[PDB]
Amino acid sequence: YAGLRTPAESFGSGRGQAHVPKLDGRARRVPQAVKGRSAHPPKTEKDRSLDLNDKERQLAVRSALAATADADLVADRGHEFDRDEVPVVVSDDFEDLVKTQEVVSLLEALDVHADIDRADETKIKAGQGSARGRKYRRPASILFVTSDEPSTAARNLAGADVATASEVNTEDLAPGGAPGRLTVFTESALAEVAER
Amino acid sequence: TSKKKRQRGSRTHGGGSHKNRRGAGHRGGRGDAGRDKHEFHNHEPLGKSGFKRPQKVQEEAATIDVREIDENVTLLAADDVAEFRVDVRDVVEEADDADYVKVLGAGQVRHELTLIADDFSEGAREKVEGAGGSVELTDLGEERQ
Amino acid sequence: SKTNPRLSSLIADLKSAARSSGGAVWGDVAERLEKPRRTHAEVNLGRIERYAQEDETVVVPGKVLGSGVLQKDVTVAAVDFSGTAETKIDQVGEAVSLEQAIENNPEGSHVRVIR
RNA sequence: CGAAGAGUGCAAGAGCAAAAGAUAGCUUGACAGUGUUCUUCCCAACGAGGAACGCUGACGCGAAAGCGUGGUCUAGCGAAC
RNA sequence: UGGAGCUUUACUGCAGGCUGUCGCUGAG
RNA sequence: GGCGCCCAAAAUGAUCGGGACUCAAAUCCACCACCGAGACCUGUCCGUACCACUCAUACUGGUAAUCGAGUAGAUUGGCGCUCUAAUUGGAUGGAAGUAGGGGUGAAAACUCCUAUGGACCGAUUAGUGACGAAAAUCCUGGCCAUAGUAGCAGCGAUAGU
RNA sequence: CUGUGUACCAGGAGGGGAACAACCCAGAGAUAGGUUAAGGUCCCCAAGUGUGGAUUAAGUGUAAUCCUCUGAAGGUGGUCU
RNA sequence: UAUGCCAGCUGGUGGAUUGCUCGGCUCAGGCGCUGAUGAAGGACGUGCCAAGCUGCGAUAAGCCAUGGGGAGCCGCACGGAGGCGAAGAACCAUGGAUUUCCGAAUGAGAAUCUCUAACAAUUGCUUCGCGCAAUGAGGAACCCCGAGAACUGAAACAUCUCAGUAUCGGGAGGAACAGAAAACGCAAUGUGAUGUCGUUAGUAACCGCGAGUGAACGCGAUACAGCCCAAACCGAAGCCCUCACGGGCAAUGUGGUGUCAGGGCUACCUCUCAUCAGCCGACCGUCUCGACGAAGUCUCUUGGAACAGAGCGUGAUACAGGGUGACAACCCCGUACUCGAGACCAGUACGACGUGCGGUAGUGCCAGAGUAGCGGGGGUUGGAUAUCCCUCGCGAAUAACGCAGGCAUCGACUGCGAAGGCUAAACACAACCUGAGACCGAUAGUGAACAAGUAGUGUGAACGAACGCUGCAAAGUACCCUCAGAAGGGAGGCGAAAUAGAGCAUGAAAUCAGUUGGCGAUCGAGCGACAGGGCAUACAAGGUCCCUCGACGAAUGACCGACGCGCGAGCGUCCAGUAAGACUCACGGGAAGCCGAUGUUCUGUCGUACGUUUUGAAAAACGAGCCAGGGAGUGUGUCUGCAUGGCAAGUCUAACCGGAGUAUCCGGGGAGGCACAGGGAAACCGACAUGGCCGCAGGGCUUGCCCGAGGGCCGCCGUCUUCAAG
Ligand SMILES: [Cl-]
Ligand SMILES: [Cl-]
Ligand SMILES: [Cl-]
Ligand SMILES: [Cl-]
Ligand SMILES: [Mg+2]
Ligand SMILES: [Mg+2]
Ligand SMILES: [Mg+2]
Ligand SMILES: [Mg+2]
Ligand SMILES: [Mg+2]
Ligand SMILES: [Mg+2]
Ligand SMILES: [Mg+2]
Ligand SMILES: [Mg+2]
Ligand SMILES: [Mg+2]
Ligand SMILES: [Mg+2]
Ligand SMILES: [Mg+2]
Ligand SMILES: [Mg+2]
Ligand SMILES: [Mg+2]
Ligand SMILES: [Mg+2]
Ligand SMILES: [Mg+2]
Ligand SMILES: [Mg+2]
Ligand code: NA
Ligand code: NA
Ligand code: NA
Ligand code: NA
Ligand code: NA
Ligand code: NA
Ligand code: NA
Ligand code: NA
Ligand code: NA
Ligand SMILES: [Sr+2]
Ligand SMILES: [Sr+2]
Ligand SMILES: [Sr+2]
Ligand SMILES: [Sr+2]
Ligand SMILES: [Sr+2]
Ligand SMILES: [Sr+2]
Ligand SMILES: [Sr+2]
Ligand SMILES: [Sr+2]
Ligand SMILES: [Sr+2]
Ligand SMILES: [Sr+2]
Ligand SMILES: [Sr+2]
Ligand SMILES: [Sr+2]
Ligand SMILES: [Sr+2]
Ligand SMILES: [Sr+2]
Ligand SMILES: [Sr+2]
Ligand SMILES: [Sr+2]
Ligand SMILES: [Sr+2]
Ligand SMILES: [Sr+2]
Ligand SMILES: [Sr+2]
Ligand SMILES: [Sr+2]
Ligand SMILES: [Sr+2]
Ligand SMILES: [Sr+2]
Ligand SMILES: [Sr+2]
Ligand SMILES: [Sr+2]
Ligand SMILES: [Sr+2]
Ligand SMILES: [Sr+2]
Ligand SMILES: [Sr+2]
């Protein structure tokens, strides 16, 4: 009802004015009127979702999984590491780590920490997003895929995303649709992922 | 770039004279208005035809062509092999919410088949037997008199 | 404007072949694959059976489906096979991708285009 | 003597002479079913209506070929409920 | 194939009046 | 037979566009030389279409005497604006904006310099749209000419010095 | 006013026609040199005050087309052949 | 050169723009009644100074208690004076006190006051006394019960449609309503209370059979829960008030029994664990609130300020977000982890007390009447003969009976007992709390970021704006001069900046003052485009340009001379396709307002705006004074193409369920839809996995000859109509 709360009417012909609805001498309601209604505004009724055939989606999760095993693709996507073998597989005991820094040492030992150095640099976006709480954005880095629980130890690492093998999704494996994220699976997670 | 996107600047957005895209007059009436007068062309002609029998006195048969049964014999390894024997009722989907299962004679029967159904067509029999096969009506199929 | 990167490379390959080797079927198949998807072929086994002959690779400028029966020992090359077509075919012959066909037969000889 | 100026139900234009006219006799095809084609609507979509031309049925007249799907042709017509 | 006011033996209806009938409603 | 003459009167100022012209600067019959378009010819470039090569609609080469105007309308590529994501950059050694000026692009537009400003701003790709104005007696706000103009006289109450 | 065929205007530039939707040339990417078209060559205004010859004295005329440019019936020892 | 034109410069005006957000908008989760114990709302008061707002109520921006909290405080609101606070104030949670008048407004009256003990009025109980109680009115919408349009669509219009919508009357709650079959009728050896969601389905049905309207059963889910009377047989064995005494009720029936697994009675069997009444009474989960809570404020440079650059270092179950003199995980709040509290779930679940389930035989003892049903007239509905309801009239049976199963009657069959009643959960809404956002960002977004329903308009119903930004810190301008002067001005002071000095960040255009460049008082009007001159020009972001000569040289293309024609103007042949020929380049010389470019002006060619209407617009046809900002293809459902993508004789899940990183996402769900066979009104019947010939592409071959998918022309097949045929 915005802009419609007024009994404003149009004098019609007779007083040398355009036939615009006025009230108390001010034009109202119509779209070309200051304070007037919005002609074709955003609507609640609009369906803002997107359907995706399950097969087409599952094929995407598998295709994203594959992108993970291609160091060249991974390097292309932007990640900064120094290995040749990827994904990076780790002992199930990784799931038992508790301290964040225990994971840093392991990543440095694996020559994968550089990517975190990459994400350790937030960006202050241009635009009003900031007025709505979107002042920052940062690069996406390592995704840790365990199987029992998301690694609480790794999650706080700059740009790090933690996920579990049974529900790791396309967005996890390819942030923003960009294939080849630098992943690190848990031996057990690696196996479960085989059947997705 | 889409058509819509290219419209800014065009004034009439493709409607021709700006005296065109107004109300329902430009459509010759709302909805099907004029379906028997000005916009009469290509419209089912006005009328009332036939009748309908009550839905709970109607029968929906489930049908299948020999061709479908035949093309899948070997594949139906879970359905008897003798001198193949198949109980159609266990093949045709939609057989539950159906009054009866009927075998139609569309296609070729390249095997000796012993078919069990509630009903067959003249041509369905001719083909099954012509291949050294047999046809057997179910007990329900006994309602053929 | 094809969106699939693979279908896009396959087409570039078919061309490279038809141009370099003695191909023409390959350039003919690339021609059709460049047209919109509704024109691409959707062929069931029954048709491949009715017109194929041994020692003559069947080339489907599209996707092979699984209705009907195939008894002939023929090698079928196609953009894709349904899970069932590939299975029913392998039982009596061989299902290969056009990427392979262009690989073994860049001259595109002794072949039969089926749609 | 006389190709047609007569006559042929009615406008007009057209058709017709061992006839499409006249007379006589006989007869009910002014029939049933179902189509093709054209027309209506040049070209170029559109209904009812119309016409020419088939196939099937049953008939009339005739020696028979054949003629008769109304009056020689073009007006005399009407949707759904 | 706009609007309104008015008219009438325009079309269609609605009040109102008259009239029959049933109920109220009974005994010889 | 050729040219002319009479027939032959209209309203603000006459006319062959005007000046003006008489062996013509008129008319007719022949002729001679010139002026004059975006047409036609010619050089280079652009677009478009087609060809060759090619993954390419990227280069490169080739063909167009038989391509190059356009309202309504159909089709296609591209410019710019908001916010989201991914990738990746700039800013107090001065961001955005604004003013004046330089460069590029057929163009939508892009970009730099100087001043101002004093804190935010992009690019690529994929999205998202309350996405582009010279016009509607369009809306709201602001502002100029009108103009130092009209009114500050008229009434039975002329009011003052 | 109402048909028909066609080219044009509409939606067609540029050159000419004093001006001037549809009359003449002309159908047109940018830029450049050149040669023409229609139409012009006394001046205004690019090019002739060109050539051979005739007629006209009315300023006839210097007005292709035209709503737009009038000139008729009737007459003429005006003048030339 | 005056008056003046165009552009710029300096300064105004103006407030666009950019940046910022204390407000909106939308979605999600939670929670949800108030009032005669006088509500909601309103009036009027109330502060040291007090107008507005907020709060409060004569105890009046407050009083008391418990807990929290803490060295400060006295609201918005940055003043002055004064006061309070370690007797622990402020502030917060919970609980309590006070709580003027009008207001349902209730002693009577009244524009917020007055007049002489008051439940006014209507009721129930009743000690028949207002003694004890009830109703009234409010609430964002939701919900239930009634009354009920028209514009509109049908391209007119009356039925129909809009629509049982808008609106009106009455009423309840936190949710309402519905609900334990006189059901269904995939007809059955079947289902088994009711909502709701998905589907069934735009199907059945309706309909100037036009436009249009439009279910259900079932299925998949959500949540699940069944009971109580009347009567029979008993017959005061009973209920209410009161401490009691005592009173009231009740044979016109309180109370027991019982309620279609029919019941009762008589006679037996067995048993309790059903139900119903009542006691105790959560876990978990969800929402909100709160406690605790790691690690740099190191160096150098720049800066007014370091959160910047460079260097060194650190935490992280914490790299969400905000603050802080500029980009901050480590300066401050907070965030992760862990914990606590209240609320809701819920007086529910479980547990437990009492009760007693059920079964056999006999028994025509009981089982809801203006009903069932029929007719007259209407309304409503998809309800068509077959919806539901109102009104007038008529009108039954008694379980051995009655109703239903989509026309009526009779029989059979199957289902079920109407004319009494209650009933949790799953579903609606959004006042209120909290959270969230590809939403807007101050002409937007609410009408409202400000005084917002404010100022203001109307007798009234009602209507209704506009106003955001100093600075890091007020350091918010002392002293001096001038002046009629707490004005204004000059000078000065602060600050990085006063061109940050009060609607005080930035500061566009229109436009104004002054001024610079060009033109300018003998001259002509779509204001320009293109080309060429004058005059003008700090740098930067452009660096070219002119003249000799020379090279290259397309189309085109000579003078002169010689010869030969023509009455003549002039032409022909040769010289010669030569000289010349746009552009481009090289040598040599030159220009620095010099070349481009920009401003203005002059000359030449063309030229009567722009948008619209129109056959025809400069138009004496329409629109606008100018500028900035604002200002028009959007959503849902269905249908039909198309491009791309997945899967393919199949394909997709919907509601919803589980998980989790909790609106995303992973898994599950195939109910159902479309496709897999059609033709026929219906009954009913039911098809080419290829038989022939042409032949494009492509393949083969010994280079016209074969194979030829797709395609083309036929055959034949299913069905409808059919004496056949067509
Ligand atoms: Cl097929
Ligand atoms: Cl472009
Ligand atoms: Cl050049
Ligand atoms: Cl549009
Ligand atoms: Mg608005
Ligand atoms: Mg911005
Ligand atoms: Mg229409
Ligand atoms: Mg009228
Ligand atoms: Mg990128
Ligand atoms: Mg705008
Ligand atoms: Mg004046
Ligand atoms: Mg036109
Ligand atoms: Mg001259
Ligand atoms: Mg004259
Ligand atoms: Mg209508
Ligand atoms: Mg309900
Ligand atoms: Mg009609
Ligand atoms: Mg039903
Ligand atoms: Mg506003
Ligand atoms: Mg300011
Ligand atoms: Na309002
Ligand atoms: Na929606
Ligand atoms: Na009137
Ligand atoms: Na609440
Ligand atoms: Na009383
Ligand atoms: Na107009
Ligand atoms: Na115009
Ligand atoms: Na005019
Ligand atoms: Na004005
Ligand atoms: Sr008028
Ligand atoms: Sr309208
Ligand atoms: Sr009709
Ligand atoms: Sr099913
Ligand atoms: Sr005839
Ligand atoms: Sr063009
Ligand atoms: Sr064109
Ligand atoms: Sr053309
Ligand atoms: Sr807009
Ligand atoms: Sr003024
Ligand atoms: Sr006076
Ligand atoms: Sr006066
Ligand atoms: Sr001269
Ligand atoms: Sr002369
Ligand atoms: Sr002469
Ligand atoms: Sr005229
Ligand atoms: Sr004339
Ligand atoms: Sr004459
Ligand atoms: Sr249940
Ligand atoms: Sr009963
Ligand atoms: Sr019946
Ligand atoms: Sr404003
Ligand atoms: Sr009034
Ligand atoms: Sr000063
Ligand atoms: Sr040359
Ligand atoms: Sr699926
Ligand atoms: Sr065929």
Short mmCIF file of C-alpha atoms (C1' of nucleotides) in Angstrom, two decimals, chain B residues 4 8 11-13 18-19 21 24-25 28-36 38 46-48 50-53 55-56 63 65 67 70-71 94 102 104-110 120-124 127 144, chain H residues 152-155 185-188 201 203-205 208-212 215-216 405-406 611-614 632-635 649-651 672-673 675-677 681-691 717-718:
data_model
loop_
_atom_site.label_atom_id
_atom_site.label_comp_id
_atom_site.label_asym_id
_atom_site.label_seq_id
_atom_site.Cartn_x
_atom_site.Cartn_y
_atom_site.Cartn_z
CA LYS B 4 13.44 -6.45 -23.31
CA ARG B 8 14.83 1.68 -23.64
CA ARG B 11 9.25 4.57 -27.01
CA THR B 12 6.69 1.96 -28.13
CA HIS B 13 8.53 -1.20 -27.06
CA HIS B 18 1.46 4.32 -29.24
CA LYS B 19 -2.32 4.26 -29.66
CA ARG B 21 -1.23 -1.11 -26.26
CA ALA B 24 -8.88 -5.04 -23.62
CA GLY B 25 -10.05 -3.41 -26.83
CA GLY B 28 -10.92 -7.75 -28.80
CA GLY B 29 -12.37 -8.40 -25.39
CA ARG B 30 -11.17 -10.08 -22.24
CA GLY B 31 -10.45 -13.81 -22.14
CA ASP B 32 -12.37 -15.74 -24.80
CA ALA B 33 -14.58 -12.78 -25.67
CA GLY B 34 -15.84 -12.96 -29.26
CA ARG B 35 -15.22 -16.70 -29.59
CA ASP B 36 -18.30 -16.93 -31.79
CA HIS B 38 -14.91 -11.59 -34.42
CA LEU B 46 -20.17 -24.09 -30.09
CA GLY B 47 -21.85 -27.28 -28.96
CA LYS B 48 -22.94 -30.08 -26.69
CA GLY B 50 -22.23 -37.18 -26.24
CA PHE B 51 -22.58 -38.18 -22.59
CA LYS B 52 -20.53 -39.60 -19.73
CA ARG B 53 -21.04 -42.78 -17.75
CA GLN B 55 -16.96 -42.92 -12.95
CA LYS B 56 -17.69 -45.76 -10.52
CA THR B 63 -2.61 -53.11 -21.24
CA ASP B 65 1.80 -55.23 -26.21
CA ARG B 67 6.33 -56.61 -28.35
CA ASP B 70 8.91 -60.41 -26.05
CA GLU B 71 11.70 -57.82 -26.19
CA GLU B 94 -0.26 -49.81 -12.93
CA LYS B 102 -5.00 -57.14 -21.15
CA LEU B 104 -2.36 -56.50 -26.96
CA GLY B 105 -0.86 -57.85 -30.18
CA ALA B 106 1.35 -54.98 -31.32
CA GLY B 107 4.68 -56.16 -32.65
CA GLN B 108 6.49 -59.46 -33.09
CA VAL B 109 6.71 -62.53 -30.88
CA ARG B 110 10.04 -64.19 -31.60
CA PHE B 120 -6.06 -60.93 -24.91
CA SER B 121 -6.84 -59.50 -28.32
CA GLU B 122 -7.56 -61.67 -31.37
CA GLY B 123 -4.21 -60.58 -32.79
CA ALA B 124 -2.40 -61.17 -29.51
CA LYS B 127 0.88 -64.13 -32.66
CA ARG B 144 -15.58 -63.79 -20.86
"C1'" U H 152 -16.31 -4.81 -13.54
"C1'" G H 153 -16.17 -9.42 -17.14
"C1'" A H 154 -19.39 -11.35 -20.85
"C1'" A H 155 -15.85 -6.51 -25.68
"C1'" G H 185 -19.18 -46.79 -1.73
"C1'" C H 186 -10.87 -47.18 -5.45
"C1'" A H 187 -18.33 -52.30 -4.39
"C1'" A H 188 -14.99 -54.70 -1.02
"C1'" A H 201 -7.91 -31.66 -10.83
"C1'" U H 203 -10.97 -33.81 -13.36
"C1'" A H 204 -16.71 -34.73 -12.10
"C1'" A H 205 -20.54 -31.15 -11.93
"C1'" G H 208 -27.45 -16.91 -22.55
"C1'" C H 209 -24.03 -25.25 -22.42
"C1'" G H 210 -21.58 -18.25 -23.89
"C1'" A H 211 -18.05 -15.77 -20.86
"C1'" G H 212 -16.91 -18.08 -17.09
"C1'" A H 215 -15.75 -29.99 -5.68
"C1'" A H 216 -15.34 -35.02 -3.55
"C1'" G H 405 -24.95 -46.38 -0.94
"C1'" G H 406 -25.54 -39.21 -6.54
"C1'" G H 611 9.01 14.97 -29.48
"C1'" U H 612 3.76 13.90 -31.11
"C1'" U H 613 -0.66 13.80 -34.17
"C1'" U H 614 -1.10 13.33 -39.48
"C1'" A H 632 6.33 3.73 -17.48
"C1'" G H 633 7.04 -4.46 -19.76
"C1'" U H 634 6.31 -6.25 -12.96
"C1'" G H 635 4.34 -10.98 -10.11
"C1'" A H 649 11.28 -45.94 -22.34
"C1'" G H 650 11.20 -43.33 -19.02
"C1'" U H 651 11.46 -38.82 -16.16
"C1'" G H 672 0.92 -38.09 -7.96
"C1'" G H 673 1.97 -35.87 -13.02
"C1'" A H 675 5.45 -39.95 -21.55
"C1'" C H 676 5.22 -45.56 -22.78
"C1'" A H 677 -1.60 -46.98 -27.99
"C1'" A H 681 -20.87 -40.38 -27.61
"C1'" A H 682 -20.92 -45.26 -25.41
"C1'" A H 683 -20.84 -50.40 -25.15
"C1'" C H 684 -16.58 -52.20 -26.79
"C1'" C H 685 -12.60 -53.23 -29.65
"C1'" G H 686 -7.33 -52.57 -30.01
"C1'" A H 687 -1.81 -51.05 -34.09
"C1'" C H 688 4.27 -51.33 -39.04
"C1'" A H 689 10.82 -53.73 -33.26
"C1'" U H 690 9.53 -52.50 -41.75
"C1'" G H 691 6.81 -54.89 -47.34
"C1'" C H 717 -2.25 -52.42 -39.70
"C1'" G H 718 -5.98 -50.51 -35.10
#
